[PDB]
Symmetry: C5
Subunit: 311 residues, 5 copies
């Protein structure tokens, strides 16, 4: 067929409802995620209307090819969704109740400023282009919106799955387009990051600082340079599970700032030795004793300065 004709001159309202069955594969570098969910559609098509008393059955099942169904599409998806139609029910007044189960790969940008303490807002944009004959608007049936209790996103906590009830209606290539915003709110599980990356990164740094309670250049150079190399291993490791951000990330700042604490430790160590060869173990030991406090203090100051700038 073709669209149901207006029963006045009114835009056709299509009622939507996404129900998350599964959430999986949140790819941080690609800024994508996969979803498996129910998509529930509902519209009024009077042409399909009937009498429950006459036909003796209060609901009518239909195969999708048989009736007019709106061309609903996802906006922020890599390829068109994979969908199997579950049910089509028509109530006496001509109300269609569409239900399909779909799966799709979704493009939603992530903000890494507060990584790995960051929280995200994933989006699923539902859309419909209107026909010449008829204008189409989307609406949210809040009863058919949700997620099941099990959905689990490896590595994240799931706060809420809600929808912006008012659609964004606009012209696109001389036709009306109705766009809905479904929002999945998530928070990163950062427990593992503390013993697996953060504390080791600090231990290797604190080991570099033992060159302040040592008079031997040879051993000091080894202490600082070897631990600096270990810090590079961690800088490379963490920047690889991350995309090319045009903004300073929080961990990125910490790591970068640490590169200076190794550089300045090399300066101190280079100085302490230079004075011993010039025969002033006098000020060499003053500098070495100063560094012992200066470094832990400046480090702790800087980390507070940064945490304040980012949280």
């Amino acid at each position: 067929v073709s669209p149901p004709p207006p029963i006045a001159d009114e835009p056709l309202t299509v009622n939507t409802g996404i129900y998350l069955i599964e959430c999986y594969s949140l790819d941080d570098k690609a800024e994508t995620f996969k979803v498996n969910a129910f998509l529930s559609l509902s519209w009024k098509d009077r042409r399909l209307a009937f009498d429950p008393v006459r036909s003796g059955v209060r609901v009518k099942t239909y195969e999708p090819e048989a009736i007019w169904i709106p061309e609903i599409r996802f906006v922020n998806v890599e390829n068109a969704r994979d969908a199997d139609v579950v049910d089509i029910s028509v109530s006496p007044d001509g109300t269609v109740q569409y239900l399909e189960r779909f799966s799709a790969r979704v493009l939603s940008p992530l903000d890494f400023r507060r990584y790995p303490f960051d929280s995200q807002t994933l989006h699923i944009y539902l859309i419909v282009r209107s026909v010449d004959t008829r204008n189409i608007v989307l609406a949210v049936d809040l009863e058919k919106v949700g997620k099941n209790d099990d959905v689990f996103l490896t590595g994240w906590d799931i706060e809420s799955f809600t929808a912006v009830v008012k659609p964004a209606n606009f012209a696109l290539e001389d036709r009306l387009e109705s766009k809905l915003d479904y929002q999945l709110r998530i928070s990163r599980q950062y427990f593992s990051y503390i013993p697996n990356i953060i504390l080791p990164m600090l231990f290797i740094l604190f080991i570099s600082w033992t060159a302040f309670w040592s008079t031997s250049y040879e051993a000091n150079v080894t202490l600082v340079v070897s631990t600096l190399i270990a810090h590079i291993a961690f800088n490379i490791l963490v920047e690889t599970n991350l995309p090319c951000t045009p903004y300073m990330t929080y961990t990125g700042a910490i790591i970068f700032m640490i590169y200076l604490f190794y550089f300045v430790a090399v300066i101190e160590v280079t100085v302490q030795h230079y004075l011993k060869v010039e025969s002033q173990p006098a000020r060499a030991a003053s500098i070495t004793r100063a560094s012992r406090i200066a470094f832990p203090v400046v480090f702790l100051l800087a980390n507070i300065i940064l945490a304040f700038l980012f949280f």
Copy 2:
């Protein structure tokens, strides 16, 4: 057609049966696995009933398009299963015997607390949404449940493949949903982990402790710092074949605890040298001799404390 009508207000029981042909690709990070199996369905549709004497044939074959077949779906799957229909047999009383061979990628969370000594319980959730006209319930035909003797999951031992006989029946978008739980129990093969990761990780640690039977700071710093670097190589290697767990894993704890045994060894070595420059080889050698026992003992204490906390 449409569902078989009730003799009376009784829900339709659909008999299920999963038979594993192949198990493969248990992805630890993604918390998924692939399965290739038979799915056997069986229901009563009186409309299909016949006389063996009249039609002269005791069993009737049907093409799937011809008859009513329940919309059975897997819950915890990435995308809908890939299935080829094997056989449809109808017995005189109107009993349908459906058989399809399918393959699917299945989402089942794994518990890494006891990794790599962990055992898992994989799930395959079978489901059916009920129609307006008729309610549908799932049931387990225990004769059509199993796995063949060859199924092999690279890297794991397979205990049992059984099913929770009582379905979980619940409302979902104002309709009854019948859900079955098929359970594949597995245990990790950890033989390789001992010589390929655990013993090397300990050898590099024991090598770090030779700095207690040495008076030379330069060589001691080298011993401890070099082996610490080797330990980082193993920490990175094992945390990469693992996902971002919001709980302390057992190996994660061991590894993290080892990072301290390197840090404290650096403290001892830094101290032993500091006293020699202050001219008290007196207590320096007391500390060095104490460490020789303190470290192996505290290490062995801690490992018992941990194994007890996790097993």
Copy 3:
């Protein structure tokens, strides 16, 4: 059917228009990118013409199988596009207004000479092969060309999406081919590259130069050789997120030039020690004091020489 016949002997003009919905996965090594966009086509087929007064409807919808549609194809694609037809509208004069939403993986070479400060010009080549009966030419409807305000290419800034209005018409396997050039202009977001790769690469180099304010060969060899090893880690890391270019890249040149500053630092350090064993701490300290300026100066000269040669 078959192509619309000419009124005289003029080739058939097909009006094109690409509208980018999404841009994603710019793979630098493969020199590809994925696109999700609208493709709008428009041609004159008099056979379809009608009377608005007689048929009582001013616009006619058609299913794609029903009418003649030109075989439009993308040139620089891995596989043929994935497309779902959105709308076909026929105006009284026989003007067809085709609209499909497609997604494709596109091959477009990138120039890495100025990497990571490089800017690119991606291409989408639209094409049509002509029939024996009729000649077909492509044209640009500039109103149906664009991108939405959200398109975001992880890791890049998007300047413009425009089209070369004049098609390239040529013979290919004894038939006319009409080719259009759609151009997506982009610029790389290089912020992260400075603290995550460039500054660390320089800090490790400046640390190598502390061997000029040191008289100890053992510590000097350690300083230079250890930092050289750290530089290899960065050379390998950056050449891996890059393809095998038959031209000198800018970062490639910097990195390569740095390999010499380590090699020549080893020469200096090897010399300084050799003279002290020959008992001329006389010129050894002249050379060491010269290097202190020579290296930072020559390095800064060279970097200017290079930046000038590339920008």
Copy 4:
């Protein structure tokens, strides 16, 4: 249609024949491989029998949908095969000659005990489930079994492609199943392994042993610990192109045994120094001179012991 009925009470024999066109992607970790081959089937269906004089053609071509074709399936495959039908020829007596060209990813476990000198036996299990009306058995037409001479598996030698002529017939879910075993025998090409992994692994070990012709702890610790680190690089590299085996592999044993030769070298070096600080360069040099022979000898003994245990 449905199966051809029996003349008298004999099961239907289906003649099989796999002809390998290509072998590729033997994935060692996944224990899989891809195959591209011809599958030739042949059975008697009298219902199709015809007269060459009447129908005027001595052989009849048929489209697969038109006639009864047995549901032949591969057992040990990830997903169902990708197949394009080449030819269906029916001879006057009702003999069908089926030919399809397929491609599939096949699950076949590999034995890594003798890796990288190991040889494998890959399997392709052909199967057929029997109908209610008729029993089906598979058979091997040895003339339609083979591989072309050009067929190569990157990184491997192909001995033979043969089939176990006698099928394994058994009950599965109350029906007869006929299973055939096609065997591809292969041997690993290990040439590259000697200069790219084995000899370097030994050179780094022999370098560690130069600490026996040296009196300097500082240099000795460096020699042994640095080469131990290089050995870890090789242990990690080779265990990554390998799956998690619940059995000791041969290379796994060699590598593990080497970890001890580094550990015991550290003991010796730690001892030699300890005696020099205790002033017995007397026995220190006895031990050091003993090690010089003890290590190469014990190493060579152990390697023979191992090679004997595995070959």
Copy 5:
């Protein structure tokens, strides 16, 4: 329909022609490459013949389902090609002019003996199996063979795309098979390999040789062992972008030979120190002075010997 019948007793000649639109993804390890090209077929089918005067049109278009089309297949492909039919033109005499645009993943072995100075000959084998009724032979229409001017294979130079005009005709499972050989000749772009791998690999080796102008064992051991470790990083890096070859590669030989120049440098350094402890700085300095020439000379001799053996 079925094949066109002969005019005598001559096999049917099918004229072929591959036209490369795109070449991409030359995977060195897998020994594959992707291709996007036109496939042009042409045969004589008299049944289709017509009169230009009577039907008034000199060419006839046909949909593929309507006429007999030969079953043309690629031999050395992973899976069957993805093809969209472009055009079918029938000239009055009954000459069919088939044209499809396809894309496929192609298996073609590469020879790594001269890597990274190697040149390759990729193959595309076109094939056709003959029917009982008729014999089919392939032929090359050299006008419909080529590549466009843009084809670019990231990382390679493309010499020529030509075809072996004489097909290889042979029996396969009691039927004639006609096989054509299309050859894509390529040469590796090795510019990047010199500054990104070769020169660094040599610089680290030349740095190891500075231990000949040094009397200090501790610093010498560091120089040689540290650079040896850096050489392992490069050996692992280059053998990973390479498959498991059962033949000595040229770079493989160079790398392996270098492993000896590090081993023998360790011998020299171990000797020079041993004589100093035995008090013969007499011959120690003779050996050290000899090595200074012996190493650069033997190295340069060996490289010439190798280049001669491989080029």
